[PDB]
Amino acid sequence: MIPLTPLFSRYKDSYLLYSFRLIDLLRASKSTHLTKLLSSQATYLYHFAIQKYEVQQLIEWAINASPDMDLQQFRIEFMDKTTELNLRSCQPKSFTYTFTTIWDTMHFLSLIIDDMVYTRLDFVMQQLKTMKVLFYNVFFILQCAMCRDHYMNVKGFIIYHIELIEIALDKEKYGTDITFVDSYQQETAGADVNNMLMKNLMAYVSMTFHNAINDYKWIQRNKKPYERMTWGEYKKLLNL
Amino acid sequence: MIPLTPLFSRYKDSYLLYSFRLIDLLRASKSTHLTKLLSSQATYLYHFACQKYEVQQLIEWAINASPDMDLQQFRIEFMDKTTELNLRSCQPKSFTYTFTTIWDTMHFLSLIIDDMVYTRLDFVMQQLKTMKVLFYNVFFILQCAMCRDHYMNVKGFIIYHIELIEIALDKEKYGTDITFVDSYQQETAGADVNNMLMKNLMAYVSMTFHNAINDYKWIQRNKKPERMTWGEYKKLLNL
Ligand SMILES: Cc1cc2nc3c(=O)[nH]c(=O)nc-3n(C[C@H](O)[C@H](O)[C@H](O)COP(=O)(O)OP(=O)(O)OC[C@H]3O[C@@H](n4cnc5c(N)ncnc54)[C@H](O)[C@@H]3O)c2cc1C
Ligand SMILES: Cc1cc2nc3c(=O)[nH]c(=O)nc-3n(C[C@H](O)[C@H](O)[C@H](O)COP(=O)(O)OP(=O)(O)OC[C@H]3O[C@@H](n4cnc5c(N)ncnc54)[C@H](O)[C@@H]3O)c2cc1C
């Protein structure tokens, strides 16, 4: 399982706030396609957080919630509903929603993938496909049109690496064990010639992706760019 | 300044064939948005095809060509139109369309990018965004539903590396020169601290992508799986 650190504590709570803010959109939805997409995303999110039958109750409650409530009244009704369904664990501790709420959710999902793979095969390959669906369908909820447009262009970078893992798991299914390496360069050296996978690959993929977004935004605003996060420091922050 | 080689000449003729097939879709288009997108993409492809006003006349000819022609009849009218506009260069020598026509176009575009960068400016930084738009908007044209769905999932891998190039040219605009290195590993090791950029990045990037797609399709077909190596690829193209 994932190591308990302060930073991982915020991730889990950002993940719950994010999940809460996503289901609040269900009552507002203006299309059947959005409703099906929000319903499945939130179901999938909680399934990575019987718990599953209670979650179906929560999700169904949110689909039929009044569309004329504001957000704070939805929060009141949600707090009660999760308490009643014995899902206090779904309840966020902090309701301040920002970019760090989205980043934490993506970094959380990355750590979850690394844990499922190191601690693992049909099951892990079905989870990895649900993860691709989650990353493909990240919503910002907050207002940032240009963030949405940027993310739709490059989200495949993350998603591509999930497929490398599936490719690696497919080789283990067929005879070649996965070999775990400590640096991205070794994994990338291997593919150009045997089944090497970086340990904590997705933590590093999403970290590298975080930096690239933040590097690119200076082009966006047209200003000269300053502490960037390093894999060394990140691993220390998360006890990896 | 792309090295003229056998594989590259096929890339070039595949590029032209892909472009001819795209503008053939303009007469059929069922939405004003798809019309907007195909004519932009075709204009862009031609603009990179290793005069612009003549291309605009070609495109405008395609927009108004009869929707009740079949494709072969369109090919007849296109071969005449390009002959009249003094654009015999846009004419493909082979009209057999396959997955290799699409791959060849993608690998062609990758080689254009690496050539603009090492022979470079706000100019190259602007041409890269157009490159991003082209890769975001690749049409298969042939029938491969699961292909389009796979490519829409992972196309960002390619596009991300175009952004790393803009990021690198932005640091050069503001002081730090690009340092060209020989492996992908040296570029990804130095991002983690300085402005290194792999030489022939997009050739390597779209080469690795091509392998990934082909490895992934054994998962897609549920089947127990000769892959292209960088050294072999650089040999084939004289990089
Ligand atoms: C998918 C996504 C796309 C975005 N696209 C854009 C855009 O196009 N234009 C724009 O202006 N903004 C964009 N943003 C927001 C942007 O990335 C920043 O969050 C914001 O612009 C300024 O945030 P910041 O530097 O103050 O903190 P942030 O960059 O948000 O980081 C906050 C926290 O995350 C942790 N952290 C910081 N860096 C890393 C890292 N490399 N790896 C792991 N953890 C880290 C740290 O704990 C830090 O406390 C996007 C955000 C997301 C989640
Ligand atoms: C964007 C895109 C997405 C696709 N998604 C799918 C999918 O999801 N499922 C599916 O079944 N098919 C998919 N395809 C088609 C698939 O990749 C193959 O083209 C097809 O299966 C034919 O396989 P092949 O090995 O015979 O030839 P190809 O893989 O098409 O190779 C043909 C030519 O390309 C050259 N070549 C081969 N490998 C490389 C390489 N790594 N780098 C550079 N050049 C190379 C060689 O010169 C060879 O002659 C996709 C194609 C594209 C262009």
Swiss-Prot record, chain B:
Please tell me which top-level EC class this enzyme sits in: oxidoreductase
> Which organism was this protein described from?
Autographa californica nuclear polyhedrosis virus
Q: Tell me which EC number(s) this protein carries.
A: 1.8.3.2
Molecular-function GO terms, alphabetical: thiol oxidase activity
Q: Which family does it belong to?
A: Belongs to the baculoviridae p33 family.
Its Gene Ontology cellular component terms are:
host cell cytoplasm; host cell nucleus
Oxidoreductase recorded as keyword: yes
Function according to Swiss-Prot or TrEMBL: Functional FAD-linked sulfhydryl oxidase that is required for infectious budded virion (BV) production and for the formation of enveloped occluded virion (ODV).
Subunit composition and interactions: Homodimer.
Hydrolase is among the record's keywords = no
Q: Where in the cell is it found?
A: Host cytoplasm; Host nucleus
Q: What is this protein called?
A: FAD-linked sulfhydryl oxidase
Q: Which UniProt keywords apply?
A: Early protein, Host cytoplasm, Host nucleus, Oxidoreductase
Q: Which reaction does it catalyse?
A: 2 R'C(R)SH + O2 = R'C(R)S-S(R)CR' + H2O2
- One of its Pfam families is Baculo_p33
